[PDB]
Each structure stands twice: as structure tokens, then as C-alpha cells.
Point group: D2
Chain length 461, copies 4
């Protein structure tokens, strides 16, 4: 229960003895006791990449000592290895520049760095602002950390999950290509379609979002670092920003660059708005896919029952055949969350004033959440549902054999009028087209098997 | 690191030894590893009120023994006293009916209740479904918990915070009523207005939201309990729902009732959409208020600087006068979050099918978050900013004395043309209206003091 | 091609000879050539009610002669009778205060009024600003016209349409109360439900929205008239605003009042945000209802086919049975429009500054459109679909007789385990519950038709 | 007042004698009397491009006579030359596939084409379905017309207007580069910034949206034509779709292609969702630009007054200096409209079922409107405001001279402590930091004029 006494302009303040933040973080924590949404640790890691790269760049410019640079890099690598997650207690609902989380990283980095210097018997000392935040400002760091973290989240979470689900749907598309079912438009019976063709629509949806995500994610590589307070770059070396972007690229493997216009970099979030547009496009596609799956799996006796899906929750021995599509429900709830998150991001990006947009935490919070919700949603839906999508061939065959929508294939052989009578007769008398077409005398058994081939009704000719 | 082995139809599964949930919660936890948003503990407490009331109602109907009832009630009160929050690990992104969190409560309640029975040397045993979920269904419990939790959140968090901020603005309105400033419309100079009158606009915004919140929160008192699986009430006593609503009311002090139409109660969330409409109304109002405050406090030399706000973060000795309106920024970020949350809720309420809307967790998540973000946001903005709003009379007086918009008060005395000359001359020559009116010879110095009384320009006459 | 030459302080400008607006409307029209959305004529009528009432009120205050008042009233009644719709050409995308449409009404009224005075051989002349806009401002008139027009739109369009559709669903609910179908939750087969009971959920949705609409529409009765430029009421008689509200009430039969806080009245649109919350709630309900109808009508052979709906478009004689639910598609398209309109309104209401919110035209445009889209949508969906909803009892009877979800009723008679065997057997062997129950020897043919009463399975007992 | 009697399956129906549509359009018009939003004529022109190309392609395949092809092509070019706009009376709120507008084009084209054949003494006759709609379906035509119309609207309206406003802002950026003002962050005074630098942020926002619009508009070039009813291409030649896209490209000059996946092409609108994501990004950017402009223009005496904007509406001679930023208000209202439109589009794209998304009209309506509102908004704001943005140098110079934020440039010379004393003294005693620096004895006036150079404070060094 012990504490450490820190100091600032307002006086003495207790910090928990086992926590590495300083007086700024503790007063900021107390001054914004709002909500339940901690500032995402992913942006903290983005700050650590930035502070790591800044230490090296400042060293290169002869502005930071070797020992200090080594100690800051070490402390930054402590954060990035996930050893210090509990030393970042600030909420999303802080100041709109994200300054307090910037100084939270400055203080923790400095605390761990000074421990390094002492263990190595150094006379030097790290200070949060003069050293860890050197050449930086409260205003160009959080947008840099945000873009670093958002791009990494796309690369490490969203891309592999999109590819996982897409490859499964592609495989189902190829395996079920020979299965002919009855299409539905307006929810009404339509002409035949291969089950694999229907699945191919879901699959190409994911290909389209992948193409579009590659376009929009590229603009997130543009970093604000180097604009300092108002975008002019005052109090920074003319090479500092490019150097930092270079070292973040080195450490992450992603081709970050310093923005061509730092005034845009502080005042705009149109690049994140565009990215979130891709996320909403994917969300809507995933909702449509998930709805098709659960409708196709509906039943067992009063629904469509064209496919089965895996049962992951225990059912009832007295209710055999009931499988709730619970993975579809998760994915569609994720989908509507992304759509609401899209509202926030689009609004917040419009609300900038002069030299800075101060809505950056809420933008980071919503965009990141949309990324990992789509990522985890697709991965889980893939593993726990999509890989287990199987046709129920008996029900699909019955739909094909019982359908009246095949009758148009009789038109080249007996004419529009004779086919119409057959379709009307089958409708009124509850017959199949085969039963009707033979009882009218217009088509024989051999002719009907020769003239009506559903495998010739799912392609242009 | 010890574990307890539980079992279901899928086999044996390890539960952490110090955790009170059963095989269903543990399998559900593993099957939905999605996102970072745990199902809100507030809705767990709503479930605890429900399970508590249902134990008493079932006891009244002769369906539950006294010992089982007392043990379930005790277990529910353990949950409601905050002793068991760690035993509810499931995320928002689960089944769309919230079944899994229902069974999480059934298991934890059953676990604690059986401990009670054994500590009292009872031969009876509690079972999660047969006892804790007796007369209930997977489908009518979560909407009941949701409405219980949302209404309580309005009563305990949103209402007191709204009244706190509103009372403060009312006090500033009365204190600054005698302070005459220059209105602005289109951001252009306009006729005088009392500073208290401008604040009265903010205050009445909060009064209006309170009136509208009293109307919309009343519909959240309608509970689904008693409709069971599809709304028909099968497998429940005809009095069960009404008895449960009665006991929840007894235990909470809020006048809950069983819904007049259980089919609506399972399939619709229009009552929550209306409530969230009020929350969005408040959010937009608070954003406007917060923008007025930070614009009035802008400066110290290149802004409007009509007011001072308290400084909570440490400033700079080399930058005196700079106070960032950081509480305004927090409150506007909360405001735009609520607007996005409103998008989710409105969408999700439209997506029901047949006998059940299965978007309930995400609706609960967003609406609850909107309630406590507005509550915490208003409370903190009140304490850390609003109570410290003070006028800067020198700056306000200069705006009034330098304004050309007072010239219209000369019209009844010297005429429109005579006043127009004075206003045009003052604009061209950089004079005050007083200086211009004397150098034209149209008004004396004594007449100008008698004819231009700003305190007569802020009321109808 | 004839023109009339008007003039202002910019010079001479041609007005079409057959058009009654003046130089300012002509200049405003040329300065905002934006989009395709004319400022809605309904808000012009709101202005006409306002100018009419203002003329009488000013006459009562001894500020306007009787002949001028009579001529202005006449001109306003010309507008309200729909004789002058072509004299209002300005778009929504004008100034944010609606000033240009205010002066459009001032000029047309003045033009028609001077024709009246000349036709009655009067020597006086009406002026748009000095007479038609007397005691008013650019800023308090448009919000007044907006609230007048929106409330009337609720009364004359939305309320009759909501009652028409609600009464139809109520009638279907009563007629189809004896029809027992199979419920669906998560799209999976569930226990029985009366068709009327399922419809009763749609019906009660509309009752709920009617209750909530009566609450939110009441706040639209609060008018801004009397606040003038900034809310202080300067240049208006202290009784003017209340008198105007009184006479608008007299002429419309709606109980309008002058707002308690004119500063709120100019700067806030939270009352309209709340109203739009009701509209979005109704829109989401209508989407759910419309989706239920088209899914229930899906088929003829590969869907659910529980109901028929009227066919309004000619189909093909070669495709008998295909009826596209085109009215459902119209209603859901209207529904999503209302949800996007809700976004605009909530955003725009947050964006006010100081003494005036200047987003009033776009708020009017979106809110009015939502009202008449829901009104026309409900009316047409009622007339062209809802009234023709009919059950297909053969398909409904088959669902009920083929369902395994009735097996629960066997439990009190033979036990859980025997009933489970019957349900398992019926599932494996493709049997009905009756066929399975008699082949196991557990239930008699007479016992089955005595123990399984679906009419006893749709109520609590 | 004369009528022509047409007929269909339901009987005889009157079409106005001067209108060229047939019985199906007249019946569809009566059956959807919903709203006030006519189906945009732009999508009618997209249909005309499609019917033109389809006539040629069908002729190339030997499915259509030369004379029929020439007559259909002629009728289509009559539509595209704007001669027939009044013959398309159907509203947006029709069926969700757009079938009725498809048939509206089929009937008008057929009517005009038969007039051509009879004028050329031809015995052949055009039929709306068998000829004008040959090889097409109700379902793949409207998405083709939508993409054709949307892409053209981007090319002909949005792109030229974006470039106009951007080129203007670039010109102001270059002219005002030598003007040094005071930056604002959080609305608080900050370090200096060139006026041109601040404008460069606006300009680069438009560059960014141009880059992102080039990426997203490309996906709108993928057309559904060839998928026919369900995407399988049945009842169409395997080359038909590609031929149509080729001839639309020939006639428009835009590189349209037939979609790689027709099933996606009918069921998805993620390509339009992404495009509308760009439009919302631009809208948000334009709102920020417009707000900076009206805040910078605020005044004349109680605002910021750093710039002047042109006055387009006549003002009052008794209120000189009053210029309402009315073009800024227009542009921000357009901006929030685009944001609400984005909600509709994102929702509607998620709501497809199986082989067809039937939300296509509402998607077309909102996306087109967003395009032309931004286009007309940018063009008009450019012509009527942006081109006339001029600095008010005396006010900008006074901000720079009066600012305390320049003091940091004294640190390299006198140190942090002595500079802090100067800034503190200047703040307390209402001095310029020049007056304070000389009164402390720390800096000579020759030193101050040499050490403090704002032109060196707006770049890295
Ligand atoms: O962002 C901050 O808190 C520090 C300085 C400023 O940008 O005003
Ligand atoms: O959800 C459940 O666990 C059980 C039944 C149902 O709601 O279908
Ligand atoms: O809007 C007007 O026409 C006049 C004054 C103002 O409201 O700024
Ligand atoms: O819209 C039609 O032409 C009818 C059916 C379909 O093609 O889906
Ligand atoms: Cl009071
Ligand atoms: Cl009732
Ligand atoms: Cl009051
Ligand atoms: Cl250039």
C-alpha cells in the first residue's frame, strides 16, 4: 500500500510505489476520472516507437548523449515487449491533443531509463521533457503514435484475419461449385445458381475490401512528427522528423514517412476518415455474409436449411436439430459497432480549429476498436463457423426439383405459350415442372431430361 | 495456478479454482475471444436483481423451497454488494440474445448459493437452470436486465450529474446577470446581451434535456420478464412476470412494470432508441456549451478572453496566461462518442427478426456507455471547469464600449440618417460611437450618456 | 420573356415579370446556385402563418394601420391557400439563419399586399421590412416557421398515417388470432405463437411510437418569435411574441406558445433532435415490420410462404406465384433515409455559436423530409400491402404439424427422457412428433391429440 | 388535357397525351406516391447510355436489326441531349431494384424509337422489353446506370470544382506566404505561423482528398451489366456484358469495364461505400476550412478580424463593417448533409439478401446528392468567398507585436530565467515583450530587433 512522493507546480502528490509514472500522470489521472475506456495500450506502443526513434535521431544530431540514447532505447524496448502495460492508467477522455498520454510515456520512459543508467553506474540522468520529449512537442507526437499504431493494427490483426476468412470462403466456393441451388431476389424464387457462385459473391466482397484497404491504409504511413507545436517545425532540427520516420520504419518494417505538409498533419484526419470508410465497407459486407449464412442455416424444419454450421454451445437432448447461429450474431453486432464508430470519426475529423484538431483520442479509440473488432470477428467467425459450412444436399436438391423458375428453358423447344401452361398447371396443381410438362403432352420424359439441365442455366450461352 | 474441472455435453473443461463460473461460462468465454469490451458489470447487477426477484416470486408460487430461495437471494446480494465482479468474464460480442451472460449469472449464483446451503448444513442443492433460471428463458432475461441496469444508471449517475452542472450554470447566470457583453450571431458583432442571459441559454438547454429525459426514461421501466422464449409466456406462471417486476421495484425503489406486450418486449428497442435520442440531444447541447466556454476563454491576447477558467494542468513560467480548455475538450469528445453510439443503437433496433431481436448486447453496451460518459463528463466539467468560470470585466467592458452595434439606440432621438453618419464615421476613423457622436455635433456628451444605456438594450420595451 | 427591374444597393436586377419576389430574393437566388433542393414550401407556409399573426399583433399594439394589416393578412392567406407556390425559388443551401427565405416571404407578401391596397383604392403602401417584418428579426422568424411547419406536418401527415397503419395491423391481429404458427428466434424453430400475437408486436411498436411522438411533438410548440436578433427582445414590444404565438394558434388550431427562454430558442435544436429520435425509432420499427412481412411472404416454393400480399405490378404468365414485396422495399428504403437524416440533425444541433445556431435550413430540410417520408411510406404500405396481408393456412398448418418444438408438452405426462427419445427419433427418421410418439409406444394416438394442444401452448398457465 | 389510353395485365390506364411513358410507368407512378424526391435524371442518362450500348452490342451479335439499333440509338441520344427530361416521373422511393425506372426508360426509348422508324417509312416496330431491354434484366441494369451516372458526376462536377477551389487556395497560400500571424492551438495563443502556411493546410486537405478520390472513383468503373437476373448471366450472350461496357466507354470517354464477379456486382455496394467515405472526408475537411474562414473573418470589433471576405448581400448603412460569412454557412450545411448521407449509404450496403441488394435507389439518391452538393458547394464558395479572402494587415501585425509567445526566441541569448521574467512582467504589466525586455535591462532594443525575428520562427533551423 506504499507510495512514492512526486512533485509538480501544484505541490506534492502520491504515486503508488510500484508504478513508474510521475506527478504529471498522477494529476492528469485524477483530473479526468471519466468513463471506463483506458487509452489503448496500442497507442502507448506507438509512442514508444516514436520515443525510441527520437532518441536515436537526436543522438545522430549530436543533441543527446550515447548513454542517454541507449537508456531511452532500452526503456522503450521494455514498453514494446509488454513488460510495463500497467504503468499507463490514463483514459481516452483526456485532453484532445493526447498530451497527457504523451507525458505519461515521457515519465515512464524516464523512470525506467534512469534505472538503466544507475545499474550501469552512469553519472547522467534522464528527464521526461528535456530528454525523452526532446525536439518534440505535445501536438505532433500523439498523431504520430496514432498513425504508427493504426497501421500496425491493420498489418498484424486485420490483414491476417481478412485473408483467413477469405481463403476459407474461396475454398468453400471451389468445393461447392458443382452444387446447383435456387437463387433468390427480393426473397422470391429465382433462376438456378451454383452454391459456389453464391459463396463467390461473399469471397469477392472480401477481395474488394482487401484492394480498397491497400489503397486507404497507405495514407496512414504519413506521420506528423517534425511539425512540433503548430506545424512550423520550430524547436526541431530540419532533419529530425524524417530521421524519426526512418527509424520507426527500421524498427517496425513498415514504410513510414514524414508528412509532406505538417499543417495538414496536425489539423486533419481525412486519411483516417478514408480508412474508416474501408472498415465500414467491410463491416457492411460482413453483415450481409453473416445474414446469408444464418438464413441458409435456418431451420431445422421451418426455415431454409440449405446448409449446416458447427454447434459450439451445448444444445438440448429434447431439442435435436436446433443450432443457433451465434457466430453470425457476434459478427453482425461487431458490424453495427463499426458503423457507429464511423459516425464518430467522420464528425470528429470535421471539428478542427486553426493549427490543431483536438479530437485525437476519441478518433484513435474508435478507429482502433473498429480494426480489432473486425479482425477478431472475422478470425473467430472463420474458426468457429465458416470452416464448418456444409451443404444439406437433400434440401438443396428438393428446392431445385420443386422450382417453377426452370420453366424458361422450355421456351426454345415448345414456345413461350406451351411453357406458360406447364408452369401455371404446375402452380395450380402442386406439381413439379416435370410432372406438369408430361401431363400436358407437350414434353416427354426423355425430352424433359434433355431440355432442362440446371448445369446449363448458371452461365451465359 | 490451480483449476477446478467442470463438465458439460462436450466433455471436461478447466475452470480457475478461484472462479465461481461453470462449464458453460468457460466454454462461452473460449468461443468468443472477440475484442476488449467485457459485458458491463451494470447489466450483471441487473441480472442479479432479476434472479433475486425470480427466486422470491417462484417461492411465492410454491415452486421453490424456502432454503433455496434464501440461498439464491443471499447469492444475488453478494453480487449486488460488489463482492463478485471478477466472476463475470464474458465480452459484449457474444450471442445476440445475451444468453451466455444469463447463464454466467445462473452459474455464479448457483455456486455461491450452494456454499450458503452447505454453510447452513442444508441437504438441498441449487442448480443453474432448474433453480436460478426457473420460470425464465434465455430470451426475456437479458432485456429485463438491460432495462433495469439502464434505468438505474440514469437515476444514479446521469440525473445527479445533470443537476450538478445545471445548478452551477444557474448560479453563474444569476451572478453575472448584471454584466453586459456584446452578442455575436454568425460570429459577427451584434447587439448587447447580459453575460447571465447567454449563460441562461446553456442552463435552459439542460432544463430542456431534463424534461425530455423524464419523458423517455419512463418507458425503460417496462420489462420483458414473463414473455419467456417467444413472448407467449409458456413455461411460466401467469403471475410470474408481474411478481418479478414488483420485487425488482421493491429492491431498487424504481417503479418497474411488466410490459403490456411481451412480443414487443422481445422484438423491439424503440424505447431505448428514444432514450438514446435524449442522450444525443444532451450531447449536442453540451458540445455547444463547451465550445462557447472555450471560445470565451480563448487568448490570452489573440482570442476573445471574455472569461477565465481554472487551470488544472501545470503551465509554464515562460508562458504565462496560456490555459488550455482541457475540460472542454474532454466534454466535446464525450459528445461525439455519444453521437456515434446513437448510430449503433438506431441501426441495431431495426434488425430484429420474427420473435426476437438478437442485437441486445451491443445495444446495452452503447447506451450504457453513453449514459455514464455524459454523467462523468458533466460531473468533471462542472467540478474542474464550470464552477470556476469568471468574467474578465476589462475585456467585456471594452467590447461594449468599442462596439458599433449600439448606434441603433440613437434612432428615436436624432433619426436614422444622423445615427448612420455617426456609425459610418466611427467605423472609418476608428472611433467609438461616443467619440463619433460628439465630433459630428449631433449628440452632446450628456445626451449620449442618457440616450445610450446598454442596460436598456437587453430587454423588450 | 418579360422582366421587371428591381433595385437594391448593388444596382438594378431583373426579376421575371410574372414573379412576385423582389431584388433581394433575386440576388439571393443567384448567389447560392447550390444543389437541387428548394427550401420546402411547408416552411414558407410557416412564415406566412407568422407574418399573418405578426400583422395582427402589430395592429393590436398600434404599430400597423388597419388597412395595412388587412392587406398583409390577405396576402398571407393567398400564400396559405397554395396560390403562390412558384414565388419561392430559394434553395435549402442558403444562409444558416434562413434570412433569405424570410425576406422572400417579406417581398412576396409585400407585393401581393400592395396589389390589395391598390385594388381597394388605398393610398398607403406596404414595405417588406418596415411593415411585413415589423417587430421581427432575421433570426427569430425562421425557427418559428420551422417549428410551426414541423408540428403541422406531424399533425396533418404523420399522425393520420400512423393511425391508419396501426388500425390495419390491429385488425389483422384480431382476425388471425386463432391461427397458430411456429415461432422463430435466432431464425431457428421455436415454440408456437399465434399469427395474431406476432402481428400484435408490430401493432404495439406503432402504439409505442405514438405514445413517444405525443411526448416529443409537444416541445415543438415552443416558438422563438419575440427573441429578435440575439434573444433579448430588443426592437420588439414585450407582448409581441406572446401575441404572435396566440394568433398562430388561433389560425392553426395547435397550441403554440412563446418559448420560456429565447436564448435557448435561437441557439438550440435539442427539441427537434428529440423529435427526430422518435422518427428514427419508428423508422427502425417499420423496417422490422416490413422485413417480417417480406420474409413471411417469401416464396412461392423456396421461402417461408406463411402469408400472401397483394400483387400491384403485372407479373409474367410464365412465372406464376412470383410476387415481389415491392412495398416492403419502399418502406425499408424510407427507413434508412430517416436514419441518415437523424445523423444530420443531431450533428447540426451541436454546432451553434454564441447567440445563434446557423444550421437551421438543413435541420428543417431533413426533419420535414423524415416526417413526410414516414407518413407517405406508412400510408402507401398500408393501402398497397398491409390491408391485403392474408395467411396461407396450409403452409402454416404444415409448419405446426411438422415441428419438433411441441415435444415439451409431453413432459408432464411421460417424462423428460421419454419425450426426448420421441424427439430424437422424429429427428432421425424424418417423422412428426405424433408419428414418433406412437411408434415408441409411449403415447397413444388418443393421448397425443389430448396432450398436445397448441392452443394451450401460446399463453401462460 | 388530352390523354392516351395504354393497357397492361390490369386493364386500361390513361397516360397524358404529351408524355412518352407507357402503362407500366403510369401504374408504377400511381402505386408509389411517396415523398418529393424524383429519381435523379442523372441515373436516367446512365440508363440511356446503357440502352444505347446494349442496342449496338445486340446488333453486333445479330440479335437486333440495323434499323431497330439505329432507332434505339437515336431515341437514347434524344434522352442524353436533355430533350426528354419530363418523361421520367418516378420517385426514388420505388422498388429496391430500380426495375420501374428501368422500364420507364424502356418505354420512353421505345416510344421515341417507333416515332423514328415511322418517320423513316419502316415497317419494323420497337417493343420495350423484347427490344430495348434485350439481353438485360431488371436487376443488372440499375446498378450499371448508377455506376455510370456516379462516375460521370465525379468527372464532370466534383473534379472541376475541387480543382477550382484548390487552385484558389494555393494562390492565396503563395500570395500570403510573407504574412506572419500568431498560431492558435486549443484556441489559445501559440507560436507564429505564416498566413500562407495556415492556408497551405486547407490546400493540402484538398490535395489529399483528390488523391483519395482518384483511388476510390476507379472502383465505380466496374459495371454489373451481363449478370442478368441473379448474376449467372443466363439469357445473355457471353460477350454481351463486355460489349456494353465497351460502348459505354466509347460514348462517355470513361474506361468502364464489366465486373469480374457479377454476384458481387448485384449484391454489394462496398465500392460506393468507399467512395462515399472519400466524400465524407472532403465534407469534414470543407467544414474545417469554412470554420477557419468565418472565425478569421469574425468581427468587425469583437472577433478575430484577421481577414476580410466579400460582401454579397446588401447590408445596413447603420451597421458598417458587418459582413455575415454566408458562404461559410452554406458550405457547412452541405458538409453535415454529406455526413448524414454517409450513414444511409453505409447502412443500405449492409442489407442485401442472397442474389440481390434491393436498396439501390436510396443509395443512388444519397451518393449523387453528396457529389453535386460538394461540387456546387465548392464552386460557389470559391467564386463568392474564397477568391476574395484578403488579410487585414494591421490586425495581423498587432497580434504578432502584442504576442507573448515570441519570448522563447530569447532563450539562446539571455537564458530561460531572464526570458521568463520578461514574459511574466509583460503579462502582468500589459506590456509587449519588447517593452518588458527593455525595462528589465536584459535586452537592448538593437538586440531585441536582432534576436526576435518572427520570419525565423516559422521554419526548422
Ligand atoms: O498541448 C499542450 O498541452 C501544450 C501546449 C499547447 O499546444 O498549447
Ligand atoms: O438461446 C438459448 O440458449 C435457447 C433457446 C433459444 O433462445 O432459441
Ligand atoms: O441576418 C441578417 O440579415 C441580419 C443580421 C444578423 O442576424 O446578423
Ligand atoms: O423485378 C422483376 O422484373 C421481377 C423479378 C426479378 O427479376 O427479380
Ligand atoms: Cl430554478
Ligand atoms: Cl394492448
Ligand atoms: Cl426559467
Ligand atoms: Cl501546385
Amino acid at each position: 500500500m506504499s507510495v512514492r512522493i512526486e512533485h509538480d507546480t501544484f505541490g506534492e502528490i502520491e504515486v503508488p510505489a510500484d508504478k513508474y509514472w510521475g506527478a504529471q500522470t498522477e494529476r492528469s489521472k485524477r483530473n479526468f476520472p471519466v468513463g471506463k475506456e483506458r487509452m489503448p495500450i496500442e497507442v502507448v506502443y506507438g509512442f514508444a516507437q516514436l520515443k525510441r526513434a527520437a532518441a536515436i535521431a537526436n543522438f545522430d544530431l549530436g543533441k543527446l548523449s550515447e548513454a542517454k540514447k541507449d537508456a531511452i532505447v532500452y526503456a522503450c524496448d521494455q514498453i514494446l515487449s509488454g513488460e510495463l502495460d500497467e504503468h499507463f492508467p490514463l483514459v481516452v477522455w483526456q485532453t484532445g491533443s493526447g498530451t497527457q498520454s504523451n507525458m505519461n510515456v515521457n515519465e515512464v520512459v524516464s523512470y525506467v531509463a534512469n534505472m538503466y543508467l544507475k545499474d550501469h553506474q552512469s553519472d547522467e540522468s534522464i528527464h521526461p521533457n528535456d530528454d525523452v520529449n526532446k525536439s518534440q512537442s505535445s501536438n505532433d507526437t500523439f498523431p504520430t503514435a496514432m498513425h504508427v499504431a493504426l497501421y500496425q493494427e491493420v498489418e498484424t490483426k486485420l490483414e491476417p484475419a481478412l485473408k483467413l476468412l477469405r481463403n476459407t470462403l474461396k475454398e468453400k466456393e471451389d468445393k461447392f461449385d458443382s452444387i446447383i441451388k435456387i437463387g433468390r431476389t427480393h426473397l422470391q424464387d429465382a433462376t438456378p445458381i451454383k452454391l459456389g457462385q453464391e459463396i463467390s459473391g461473399w469471397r469477392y466482397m472480401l477481395d474488394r475490401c482487401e484492394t480498397m484497404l491497400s489503397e486507404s491504409k497507405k495514407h496512414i504511413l504519413n506521420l506528423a512528427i517534425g511539425g512540433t507545436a503548430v506545424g512550423t517545425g520550430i524547436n526541431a532540427h530540419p532533419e529530425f522528423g524524417d530521421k524519426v520516420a526512418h527509424y520507426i520504419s527500421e524498427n517496425t518494417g513498415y514504410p513510414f514517412v514524414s508528412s509532406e505538409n505538417k499543417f495538414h498533419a496536425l489539423t486533419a484526419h481525412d486519411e483516417v476518415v478514408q480508412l474508416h470508410g474501408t472498415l465500414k465497407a467491410l463491416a457492411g459486407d460482413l453483415m450481409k455474409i453473416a445474414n446469408d449464412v444464418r438464413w441458409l442455416a435456418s431451420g431445422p424444419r421451418a426455415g431454409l436449411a440449405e446448409i449446416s454450421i458447427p454447434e459450439n454451445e451445448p444444445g438440448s437432448s429434447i431439442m435435436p436439430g436446433k443450432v443457433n447461429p451465434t457466430q453470425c450474431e457476434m459478427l453482425t453486432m461487431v458490424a453495427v459497432q463499426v458503423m457507429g464508430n464511423d459516425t464518430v470519426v467522420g464528425f470528429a475529423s470535421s471539428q478542427g480549429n486553426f493549427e490543431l484538431n483536438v479530437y485525437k483520442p476519441v478518433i484513435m479509440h474508435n478507429t482502433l476498436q473498429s480494426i480489432y473488432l473486425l479482425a477478431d470477428g472475422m478470425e473467430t467467425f472463420n474458426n468457429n463457423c465458416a470452416v464448418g459450412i456444409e451443404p444439406i444436399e437433400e434440401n438443396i436438391d428438393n428446392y431445385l426439383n420443386q422450382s417453377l423458375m426452370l420453366v424458361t428453358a422450355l421456351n426454345p423447344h415448345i414456345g413461350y405459350e406451351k411453357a406458360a401452361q406447364i408452369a401455371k398447371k404446375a402452380h395450380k396443381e402442386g406439381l413439379t415442372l416435370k410432372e406438369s410438362a408430361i401431363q400436358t403432352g407437350y414434353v416427354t420424359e426423355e425430352q424433359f431430361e434433355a431440355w432442362i439441365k440446371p448445369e446449363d442455366m448458371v452461365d451465359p450461352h
